Symmetry: D2
Subunit: 139 residues, 4 copies
């Protein structure tokens, strides 16, 4: 499993007065999508990991997104996520989001590349670490 | 200090397609208001407390709210908070929210009573505790 | 259909530093649950209604909630919603939320009564209306 | 006024179980910051504009962000926003976010470039328009 799919329904509250999905919401869903990818890959919840290995998760370091089409309540999004590239202590997470309107229309809604890292609590702040080998294996 | 005031500006994203503040947002602001009350009263951040006393904060157990008027972006809210009643291991937090429209109109927007408790991590889950005497003193 | 069920997975971002679902989030899900109830009952989206009848939705006027147990990421919630009582221009929406932990534990997480109304844009602000007879029929 | 400053306090609910600001929240604040820039520049609220000109706001088309440091509750952020470049029917909005910890520490927290456009409701969906000349004037 390298490419993982996730669905998300858009609710009324997820939209602005303009009637379209309020942008920041897409980041919420990609965050979920990211996390959903490792779990679906076999990784253990951050809950275990945080005690087992001391890994608190995968904070974001950078990201690039392009929105090409609008979306609104009732529409369902399909999120496709895969690991684009592995670096030394960070990886490139790719997400392609498509919108399915009522009446089955399907348009690409957004694309985003998220650069994240495995991290742990290092005294005061968080510290990145080399991606564990069982994680690269799993993914 | 028994009655604490807090302001909050309403943003565009805080509103629904209907053009008014999306309800759940008010809970976000009251949460902040609650917390802002103890801090303004003298309590130390949960950060310290959590190590000093082991108090993780004040989870909500119950609440009752009435919305009487709408609100929208650009409007500023004034939040008034005080401790209505102290029980044995819980307290009644009262919030009165007023809206000031552009053009200086002022209407009561909402009223809410939040029943909360001081809590700590008790092994698996959170546990309530008797309100510390220096907290009753402070408030 | 008088009692409607809805599931909701809890994500990492939906939790606070304390590790439990941040309260305001439950209101987000009940909002969705409310809306999901009419749709599942047969009502048309607010989108149509807003043009057909001019109904913008069902704003909340009051609500009472009790939280009895905590919840965290990975847990799945089951939301049960029904119309408790119909008044003249408002109704009582009842929600019972249960949490299913990993390891299949099932505890009631929260209960809430939301008093809402059918509304329309009345010039400056929103106005309530008598619940349409085809809505009472449907529900 | 080309460079506009905005402050934002971080609340407890704005953080994840890991104890740091949950990422998607930064987008919420930049959205506010963006909007705050035009208003502070002289533009009229979207409310007026939407009737006066029919401009619904400035949807985002693209964006690039880099997070360099963490942030947590109690910390105050300073947001600096300016228009980097004007294109034909779109502009480049630049945001530099700095964190001020308790104890007056000051670190750059994040940087982001948001590519947005002036838009209007074009029948079914939104349409971009040439940036009005009084807006370029104002900014």
């Amino acid at each position: 499993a390298r490419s993982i799919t996730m669905q998300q329904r858009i609710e009324f509250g997820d939209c602005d007065p303009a009637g379209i999905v309020w942008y920041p919401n897409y980041h919420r869903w990609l965050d979920a999508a990211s996390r959903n990818y490792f779990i679906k890959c076999g990784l253990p919840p951050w809950r275990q990991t945080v005690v087992e290995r001391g890994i608190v998760g995968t904070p974001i370091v950078s990201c690039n997104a392009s929105f090409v089409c609008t979306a609104s309540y009732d529409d369902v999004l399909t999120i496709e996520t895969c690991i684009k590239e592995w670096r030394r202590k960070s990886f490139v997470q790719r997400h392609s989001v498509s919108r399915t309107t009522p009446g089955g229309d399907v348009q690409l809604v957004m694309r985003a590349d998220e650069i994240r890292v495995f991290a742990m609590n290092d005294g005061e702040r968080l510290r990145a670490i080399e991606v564990p080998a069982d994680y690269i294996e799993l993914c």
